[PDB]
Design a protein around this ligand. Structure first.
Ligand SMILES: Nc1ncnc2c1ncn2[C@@H]1O[C@H](COP(=O)(O)OP(=O)(O)OP(=O)(O)O)[C@@H](O)[C@H]1O
Ligand SMILES: Nc1ncnc2c1ncn2[C@@H]1O[C@H](COP(=O)(O)OP(=O)(O)OP(=O)(O)O)[C@@H](O)[C@H]1O
Ligand SMILES: [Mg+2]
Ligand SMILES: [Mg+2]
Lengths: 239, 889, 404, 413
């Protein structure tokens, strides 16, 4: 109505185009992530393989460096563009200053890049929301979550994608004030968080972990079902 | 046209039957192998239940009909094997072979011979293979055979054995809801000899299981709502042993057999008391069973538990008789003071306060009768020990002002002001009793008798009141002294009090009202036996009423007392006896229908109602039988108050149109009594019908009839915004609704609407389905039946105690041994389940929940939680022990 | 006293609670039948045994003959003098007629219909009521069969509408104590085939006041002056009666944005809409009348019909979620014979876009397909064929997952 | 493939599991409904609706004078006269439904008091003039006027100070203190139009002025004027104004002028053009010569842009008052008005609520108040509290037509 341009103000002061691109993220597959005392783990679902093409070129989680991880939602090509730009930026920073890249610096850089496609006309805003997970500052973990508008925040347990609200609802009650040790218990929490897959195929979950120490670790489809079995075993204790 | 590529069965199973007559002929190979090859196919196709168009029956019926007709009768060489096979393979097709006229052909094949067990291939099929047509045959052919020739051939013995095996089959095929159709056959087989069905089904359920009986019990108990009287009694008595024989619960036997005390048989109640003393061995199973035995069914049972264990095993009788009554009074005091009850409200009369500005100014009411009605309002609203100290001195000044009759009524108001009191109510009355005034003394005696009414203990049976009775020097100071006694021993049929009150009517006093009150007292003292009272009453009627032709006070006390003395019996022999006793002139024949209907308190008999409406139908009644039609309409509500609630609505439909629109005297005058007696809940249907034809008095008709409609306006207890109507009617009651003719009526109605917040309930329905007693008094109160001019004077003596069968409102109470627990439950609407396989939700609206000892309310079902196990009666009794048991780790 | 409750309900008795081939139902309907026959017999005897009759007082026939046999009906418009009023006939021809006696000269009022003679044309009576057979026909008197038991679970909406239309009647003690006026207007909006008319039926089934039902594109006549007058008479007859309720269905045929254009017929439509809009909430009073108004698309309505004060509660009916589908399936197949094999879990969970009417059609199609091969019991494959083979028209969007 | 159910299969289908009480049931319902039909037919109605009086009132007058009243009098149809020939005894008359005839007087009537232009009674046969009649007073216009006092006070309108001042200036002051205008030398206007968004608060102000008016008030139905017959709307318009002029100090109030007419277009052949005439009959009657005087007219509408510009001529409509959404003190005052008659917790502040409803009119605030009451009812409470209003606000104002509810003010912190 009063929109259709990226630099106009509605009578009550909104930027309707940014808001319109805001909802475009929720069309993607959900993904969550949490941090722990020793381990940080992020999980993705809704892979829904088409069983007739290879799956090594459909990656959704990528490492911006050797000691940081990122996940995304929304459409695809913009994600690839941002990934490439971020990798170049972090490597250049390591070149100009010998210290490694802190998890906060690269997030702020991504925020600035997404910010600078909003002021001018003739530039369509990016349509993705990112999750950054790292621990690089003296062995301490953190995660951050960004927005298509260009503002970042610090969380402890987030959820994005189609239907993140229910995952929230689950999280704010099931996440415990108990500072979570025993990393396997954190992974159990992540599995039970993704348990609300809209169809629960059992084999539509994928995890990635990072234990303050080593590079990326990827789970394989043999411990996922043992975790499922242990979840059923704990759940059968209803009486 | 679908035939071809598969119909080889219409080829080979067509040639085999075609030469089957040849098999019965010289070739025994067809007699054996072909019979086997047909029977095996038939059994296989009717065995499975997957294809409901049987592929063998439906390709044979056309030829198979004549084949079976000409095979069995034209064989003449019936060997066991060949004839058995023929009967087996010609008995099954008949359901498809013939049409509805098949009752004469259920046996044309099966009866020829019994091949083994007919249920062997008819064992696990529910209502498909054979049990449907077998059930139909046993239902109808057996009844036709046993209509008069009950003792006959196999049609009784072997039919009995077949019924037993078919009941076993109904249980063993699927054990499904078709079990509730097994009682059908039980009531269709030996219709008249139902006993030999019901006992059989009892034994069959004895080794069935101890848990699958409850559904059968409920089905029978709700099938007993209406049937033949003898069938009703048989079904009730056969239900009685069911919770004992198969199941060993035996806890509801004491509750579901009190219902068979009066209606079933006096000896039935004797055996119920016998089983209640034989049982109750567990101490819990005695204090609960005795809770309802007094305050929920009737009195006169304080001496049946006085055996040689009278320390605690037989001291419970005195507890539940009167000591439990005192404890309940103390509880109903403490709880009421805890929740909602200020000492001296007296506001509802003063509620007409926003009208002070309306209609100009006040200072209009100066009527002396007003003071009477005011006192009655202040009495009725002040029940449940709402005593007013020195606030009743207004009644003392009015007692010293005017209205000697109003003085008596005001004096008697203190009876119901301090109700159900034993400590000091008599002491409070005694101070004003010695006042040297005849009316004051009579009112004091009435109040004293009212105070201990319903307690029926041995406190002061005849100490004070009877000493004045035996000194009946004054005409007025003689009736109430005896009349209250009748109320005081209403539940007691003690012959001592009966013969002691008989001399009141035998004194030949000039006061006919005294004789009437004595008749009322003797009627309301006993409701069962003692025909000698009936003989004495009838003799007094013959010797007195013959010489007089006065007001119906004769018809208001003699025939009413006669009906009360023989109330609630469907034998009709007592009805015929009293009928042939009093054949006389029509003014006395008014009592014929009264005594006829008083013995029909409640049952399903459309014959009875049909003759009830045919009797006073139109007749044009040119001042001939107006009293007869008046009692006919006043009683049409009776006999219909337990019709399974269909009859109530249908009756309201009939009365709303028939008598209301095309009526002259029975309609325009005595048509509001039936609504005033039909229900006491308060619903928009009747509350709308009444005012529309009532607030418009229709002065053209006997405008006083509209006044009657005012009284039944207050037929609803439990105060509500109904007031808002009558309040308005009060203002139009200044000019219209004549003050000198309807002011006291409107005021007493408005006092009855919001009368006593606690103890509001008064509907003679303790338990979901019980109405044992309490209708006795309520009948006399409503027995004014017009003649409100007479009521204006009589009521000052009568209306104070006219309705004195009030039970307390509240039913929800923990009722622990020390009353420890408070409450944990969810009150809700009435039941929402009858015969559901899925979970039974009794509580339609569980949203409502309270955790106090507070009131129950009329349309409320209560369920519990927090695992208290509530092992008393699980429904509601106001005195459940509810011991805890939670063996659930 | 007004015309009073004027209740509209047949509602004899519904207790067929066995809902099977049990004896209880047979005995109960036996009781119903014999009561009805009893009442019929009573009315026959009432009408057959009337012996009294004169009913003319030697003058009633005199008055009957003094007035003409084919009396006509006219419209009084003024009364200049006693015994010389002035009336008019249909064609607008006034006549300075006289007024005779035997006509209570109390209830006559300018605008009231009167009874006139032919030959001399004087006033001889007053016609008590005049309601055309377009408004009395709108009324209902036989309640529809459904009730709350059949609704598949809409607890929020049911509680809402109950607080709207039912609760102020039965228990009107709270509202006065709090000092609030209960709401009077309700809109039911949402996608098609969800249950908007079920609540109308269910409410009409169980109530105590008068019910009036009107469908949208019926308030329209072609004579340029009948629409608004018919609306006015509708509300007049509703208010003179009991605390009635009015149900206008498929509104959007009447109200849409009130813009300015050329044709005169559309001007008439706008004129009628605007008259109703005044009638609902205009000058002084409104009365004790509730209005329910149902539509399946709401954005195209005139902003003056929807503002609060005129319509106070709006109720959206959304598509069913997976909790409700089980309830719907349990209701619509209750009276069905059915086999131990089937499990409704697969049918309810496989799909995620369907409504109540769709479920009913699936049930009937599956049952019929079972009948096709000569059976009564229903199996799982029948339900599979019913769901997939028909009952699904399609749509497309978001191609090939641009989002991942 | 598939096959068609044959007769034998149909026969067997109605055969297995029928139960022993199938038809035995249905025949019952059948005859039930049939006897229902019968019992309802046997009932019809009764009337007793002729208005006959008690017989005592009839008296014996029925024979004496009612019988002697049919034959002596005549109908005497009533018409008007347009052009009285003077000194020439021929008159001209029109029935307004018939044609025009030349007619004369009767024998007994003087030819003096027969002033031209008034209603007369006329014989059916000879069309002679017999008696005069007073000018018509229209039956619908008699109850057109309110003759009643709605109980709404100036004290009950909050947040509209200026508009109340201007309306008072137009209506009340010239009717009570008519000296300031002649003292300074100005003339009082005679027409005010009201406009604003729907719900702003117009008709309420109109009702308020009809309480302290101390003068005749006339409510006018916008949709009553149009008629099925030709030539009716204009007639009622002129009757309205003449009857208004008869008495002194009467006010006129209109609603939805856009119903009667606010545009003029060509063609519209047939039915439409009639309404055109009607509106014209108003306009030329609204002004012209002979100042109307202390007769004031009010126009109120919600759709001002569709009005005929001829209405905005100086002299017809003089002042136009705009109603606007209340800013801040309007909201606090409106809350204070509608929430002084319900039980509330005594320590609640209303300015906080005034913040959280930025663009809202009086209707929405009133609905918020009642809604908070309902949420108090749902739980068993006697006195409503803070949280009640806080929840009702989310229920009403914002909830309808929301956007980005889940994103919320993520970017606006
Ligand atoms: N929740 C439900 N429970 C039971 N039946 C339902 C439910 N929802 C829908 N139905 C079914 O939907 C039908 C009712 O029609 P409905 O009220 O949905 O029409 P509507 O919304 O007025 O549609 P339209 O736009 O065509 O007029 C019935 O077949 C009813 O059984
Ligand atoms: N300033 C205000 N003060 C008090 N109440 C107000 C105010 N503004 C609006 N209202 C409320 O608005 C409601 C109706 O207002 P009103 O009838 O005047 O609207 P309107 O603008 O004439 O509408 P429409 O043009 O649609 O007829 C009333 O309940 C009134 O209390
Ligand atoms: Mg519909
Ligand atoms: Mg308005």
């Amino acid at each position: 109505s009063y929109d259709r341009a990226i630099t106009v103000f509605s009578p009550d002061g909104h930027l309707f185009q940014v808001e319109y691109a805001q909802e475009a993220v929720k069309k993607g597959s959900t993904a969550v992530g949490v941090r722990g005392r020793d381990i940080v783990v992020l999980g993705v679902e809704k892979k829904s393989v088409a069983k007739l093409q290879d799956e090594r070129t459909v990656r959704k989680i990528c490492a911006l460096d050797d000691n940081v991880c990122m996940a995304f939602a929304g459409l695809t090509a913009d994600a690839r563009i941002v990934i490439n730009r971020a990798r170049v930026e972090c490597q250049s920073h390591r070149l100009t200053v010998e210290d490694p890249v802190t998890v906060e610096y690269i997030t702020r850089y991504i925020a600035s890049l997404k910010q600078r496609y909003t002021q001018s006309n003739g530039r369509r805003p990016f349509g993705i929301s990112a999750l950054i997970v790292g621990f690089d500052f003296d062995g301490t973990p953190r995660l951050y979550q960004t927005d298509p508008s260009g503002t970042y925040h610090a969380w402890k347990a987030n959820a994005i994608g189609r239907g993140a609200k229910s995952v929230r609802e689950f999280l704010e009650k099931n996440y415990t004030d108990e500072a979570i040790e025993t990393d396997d218990l954190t992974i159990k929490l992540v599995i039970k968080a993704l348990l609300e897959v809209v169809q629960s195929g059992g084999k539509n979950i994928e995890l990635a972990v990072m234990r303050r120490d080593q590079s990326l670790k990827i789970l394989n489809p043999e411990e996922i079902e043992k975790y499922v079995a242990e979840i059923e075993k704990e759940k059968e204790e209803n009486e | 046209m679908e035939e071809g590529g598969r119909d080889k069965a219409p080829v080979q199973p067509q040639q085999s039957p075609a030469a089957a007559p040849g098999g019965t002929d010289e070739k025994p190979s067809g007699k054996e192998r072909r019979d086997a090859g047909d029977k095996d196919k038939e059994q296989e196709l009717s065995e499975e239940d997957k294809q409901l168009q049987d592929e063998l029956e439906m390709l044979v019926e056309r030829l198979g009909e004549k084949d079976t007709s000409l095979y069995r009768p034209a064989l003449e060489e019936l060997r066991r094997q060949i004839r058995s096979s023929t009967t087996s393979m010609t008995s099954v097709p008949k359901p498809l072979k013939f049409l509805r006229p098949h009752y004469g052909k259920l046996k044309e094949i099966y009866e020829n011979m019994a091949p083994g067990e007919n249920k062997r291939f008819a064992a696990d099929i529910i209502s498909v293979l054979a049990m449907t047509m077998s059930g139909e045959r046993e239902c109808l052919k057996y009844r036709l055979v046993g209509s008069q020739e009950e003792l006959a051939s196999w049609g009784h013995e072997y039919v009995r054995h077949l019924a037993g095996e078919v009941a076993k089959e109904w249980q063993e095929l699927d054990d499904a809801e078709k079990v509730q159709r097994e009682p059908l056959l039980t009531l269709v087989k030996e219709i008249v000899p139902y006993n030999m069905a019901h006992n059989a089904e009892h034994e069959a359920c004895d080794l069935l299981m101890e848990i699958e009986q409850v559904d059968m019990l409920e089905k029978d108990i709700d099938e007993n709502a209406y049937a033949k009287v003898c069938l009703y009694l048989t079904s009730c008595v056969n239900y009685v042993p069911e919770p004992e024989n198969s199941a060993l619960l035996r806890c509801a036997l004491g509750v579901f057999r009190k219902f068979s005390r009066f209606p079933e048989a006096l000896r039935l109640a004797l055996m119920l008391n016998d089983m209640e003393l034989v049982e109750d061995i567990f101490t819990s199973c005695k204090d609960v069973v005795v809770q309802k035995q007094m305050a929920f069914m009737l009195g006169r049972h304080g001496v049946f538990l006085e055996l040689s264990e009278d320390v605690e095993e037989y001291e419970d009788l005195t507890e539940i008789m009167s000591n439990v009554q005192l404890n309940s009074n103390f509880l109903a005091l403490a709880r009421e003071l805890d929740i909602m009850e200020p000492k001296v409200p007296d506001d509802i009369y003063k509620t007409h306060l926003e009208n002070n500005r309306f209609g100009g100014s006040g200072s209009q009411v100066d009527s002396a009768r007003m003071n009477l009605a005011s006192s009655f309002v202040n009495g009725f609203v002040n029940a449940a020990f709402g005593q007013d100290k020195l606030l009743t001195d207004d009644g003392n000044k009015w007692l010293y002002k005017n209205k000697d009759h109003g003085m008596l009524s005001a004096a008697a108001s203190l009876g119901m002001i301090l109700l159900w009191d034993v400590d000091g109510g008599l002491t409070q009355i005694d101070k004003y009793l010695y006042s040297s005034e005849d009316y004051i003394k009579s009112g004091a005696l009435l109040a004293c008798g009212i105070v201990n009414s319903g307690v029926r203990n041995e406190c002061d049976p005849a100490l004070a009141l009877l000493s004045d009775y035996v000194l009946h020097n004054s005409n007025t100071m003689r009736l109430g002294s005896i009349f209250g006694l009748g109320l005081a021993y209403a539940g007691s049929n003690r012959e001592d009090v009966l013969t002691l009150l008989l001399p009141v009517m035998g004194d030949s006093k000039s006061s006919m009202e005294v004789a009437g009150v004595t008749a009322l007292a003797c009627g309301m003292i006993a409701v069962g036996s003692c025909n000698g009272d009936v003989t004495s009453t009838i003799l007094q009627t013959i010797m007195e009423k013959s010489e007089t032709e006065l007001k119906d006070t004769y018809a208001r006390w003699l025939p009413l007392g006669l009906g009360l003395n023989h109330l609630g019996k469907g034998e009709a022999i007592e009805a015929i006896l009293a009928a042939l006793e009093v054949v006389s002139e029509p003014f006395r024949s008014f009592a014929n229908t009264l005594v006829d209907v008083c013995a029909y308190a409640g049952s399903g008999n459309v014959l009875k109602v049909q003759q009830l409406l045919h009797i006073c139908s139109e007749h044009f009644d040119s001042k001939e039988k107006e009293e007869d039609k008046d009692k006919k309409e006043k009683k049409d509500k009776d006999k219909k108050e337990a019709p399974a609630d269909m009859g109530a609505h249908q009756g309201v439909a009939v009365l709303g149109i028939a008598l209301i629109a095309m009526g002259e005297e029975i309609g325009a005058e005595m048509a509001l009594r039936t609504f005033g007696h039909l229900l006491r809940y308060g619903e928009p249907t009747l509350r709308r019908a009444v005012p529309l034809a009532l607030a418009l008095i229709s002065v053209s008709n006997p405008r006083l009839n509209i006044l009657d409609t005012l009284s039944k306006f207050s037929h609803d207890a439990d105060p509500e915004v109904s007031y808002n109507s009558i309040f308005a009617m009060g203002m139009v009651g200044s000019g219209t609704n004549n003050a000198r003719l309807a002011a006291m009526l409107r005021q007493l109605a408005q006092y009855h609407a919001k009368d006593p917040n606690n103890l509001f309930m008064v509907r003679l329905a303790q338990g979901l389905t019980h109405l044992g007693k309490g209708t006795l008094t309520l009948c006399p109160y409503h027995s004014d039946r017009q003649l409100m001019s007479q009521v204006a004077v009589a009521g000052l003596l009568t209306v104070l105690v006219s309705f004195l069968d009030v039970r307390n409102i509240i039913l929800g109470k923990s009722h622990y041994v020390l009353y420890g627990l408070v409450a944990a439950m969810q009150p809700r609407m009435l039941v929402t389940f009858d015969e559901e396989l899925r979970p039974l939700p009794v509580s339609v609206r569980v949203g409502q929940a309270v955790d106090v000892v507070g009131q129950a309310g009329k349309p409320k079902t209560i369920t519990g939680f927090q695992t208290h196990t509530t092992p008393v009666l699980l429904a509601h009794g106001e005195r459940a022990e509810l011991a805890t048991e939670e063996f659930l780790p | 006293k007004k015309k009073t409750k004027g209740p509209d309900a047949a509602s004899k008795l519904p207790l067929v609670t066995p809902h099977t081939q049990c004896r209880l139902k047979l005995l109960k309907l036996e009781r119903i039948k014999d009561y009805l026959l009893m009442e019929e017999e009573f009315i026959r005897n009432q009408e057959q045994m009337k012996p009294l009759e004169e009913k003319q007082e030697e003058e009633r026939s005199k008055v009957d003959d003094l007035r003409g046999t084919p009396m006509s009906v006219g419209t009084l418009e003024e009364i200049i003098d006693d015994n010389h009023a002035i009336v008019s006939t249909s064609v607008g021809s006034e006549h300075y007629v006289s007024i005779l006696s035997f006509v209570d000269k109390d209830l006559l009022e300018p605008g009231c219909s009167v009874l006139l003679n032919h030959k001399v044309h004087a006033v001889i009576g007053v016609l008590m009521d005049d309601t055309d057979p377009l408004v009395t026909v709108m009324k209902v008197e036989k309640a529809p069969q459904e009730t709350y038991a059949d609704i598949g679970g809409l607890d929020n909406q049911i509680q809402e509408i109950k607080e709207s239309v039912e609760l102020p009647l039965t228990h009107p003690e709270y509202y006065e104590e709090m000092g609030i006026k209960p709401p009077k207007g309700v809109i039911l909006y949402g996608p098609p085939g969800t249950g908007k008319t079920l609540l109308a039926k269910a409410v009409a089934n169980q109530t105590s006041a008068t019910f009036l039902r009107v469908v949208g594109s019926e308030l329209i006549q072609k004579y340029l002056g009948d629409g608004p007058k018919l609306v006015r008479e509708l509300f007049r007859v509703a208010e003179e009666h009991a605390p009635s309720i009015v149900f206008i269905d498929e509104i959007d045929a009447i109200g849409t944005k009130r813009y300015d254009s050329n044709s005169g017929g559309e001007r008439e439509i706008q004129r009628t809409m605007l008259e109703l809009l005044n009638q609902l909430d205009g000058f002084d009073s409104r009365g004790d009348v509730k209005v329910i108004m149902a539509t399946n698309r709401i954005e195209t309505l005139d902003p003056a019909l929807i503002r609060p004060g005129r319509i106070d509660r709006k109720i959206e009916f959304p598509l069913p979620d997976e909790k409700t589908k089980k309830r719907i399936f349990q209701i619509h197949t209750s009276r069905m014979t059915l086999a131990d094999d089937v499990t409704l879990d697969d049918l309810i969970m496989a799909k995620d876009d369907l409504s109540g009417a769709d479920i009913k059609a699936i049930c009937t199609e599956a049952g019929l397909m079972a009948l096709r091969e000569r059976r009564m019991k229903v199996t799982n494959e029948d339900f599979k064929k019913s769901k997939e083979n028909v009952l699904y028209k399609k749509q497309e969007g978001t191609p090939e997952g641009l989002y991942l | 493939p598939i096959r068609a159910l044959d007769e034998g299969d149909i026969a067997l289908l109605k055969t297995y599991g029928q139960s022993t009480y199938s038809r035995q049931i249905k025949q019952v319902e059948d005859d039930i409904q049939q006897l229902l039909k019968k019992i309802n037919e046997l009932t019809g109605i009764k009337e007793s609706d002729t208005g006959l009086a008690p017989p005592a009132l009839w008296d014996l007058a029925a024979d004496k004078q009612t019988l002697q009243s049919e034959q002596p009098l005549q109908v005497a149809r009533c018409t008007k006269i347009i052009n009285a020939d003077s000194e020439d005894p021929k008159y001209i008359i029109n029935v307004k439904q018939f044609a025009k005839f030349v007619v004369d007087l009767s024998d007994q009537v003087a030819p003096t008091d027969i002033e031209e232009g008034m209603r007369v009674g006329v014989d059916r046969n000879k069309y002679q003039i017999h008696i005069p009649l007073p000018p018509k007073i229209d039956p619908t216009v008699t109850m057109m006027q309110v003759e009643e006092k709605p109980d709404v006070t100036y004290s009950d309108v909050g947040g509209c100070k200026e508009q109340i001042e201007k309306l008072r200036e137009v209506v009340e002051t010239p009717l009570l203190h008519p000296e300031r205008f002649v003292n300074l030398g100005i003339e009082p206007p005679k027409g005010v139009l009201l406009f604003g968004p729907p719900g702003t608060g117009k008709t309420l102000c109109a009702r308020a002025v009809a309480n302290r008016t101390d003068a005749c008030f006339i409510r006018v139905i916008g949709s009553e004027l149009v008629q099925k017959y030709v030539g009716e709307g204009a007639r009622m318009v002129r009757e309205l104004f003449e009857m208004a002029r008869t008495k002194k100090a009467c006010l006129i109030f209109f609603d939805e002028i856009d119903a009667i007419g606010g545009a003029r277009f060509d063609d519209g052949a047939g039915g439409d053009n009639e309404v055109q005439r009607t509106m014209l009959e108003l306009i030329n009657q609204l002004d012209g010569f002979d100042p109307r005087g202390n007769i004031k007219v009010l126009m109120a509408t919600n759709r001002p842009d569709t009005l005929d510009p001829a209405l905005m001529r100086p002299g017809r409509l003089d002042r136009k008052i705009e109603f606007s959404l209340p800013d801040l003190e309007g909201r606090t005052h409106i809350f204070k008005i509608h929430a002084r008659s319900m039980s509330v917790e005594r320590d609640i502040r209303f300015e906080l609520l005034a913040r959280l409803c930025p663009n809202s009119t009086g209707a929405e605030i009133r609905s918020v108040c009642t809604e908070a009451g309902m949420f108090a009812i749902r739980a068993r409470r006697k006195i409503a509290t803070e949280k009640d209003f806080l929840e009702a606000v989310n229920k009403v104002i914002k909830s309808y037509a929301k956007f980005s509810a889940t994103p919320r003010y993520m970017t606006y912190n």
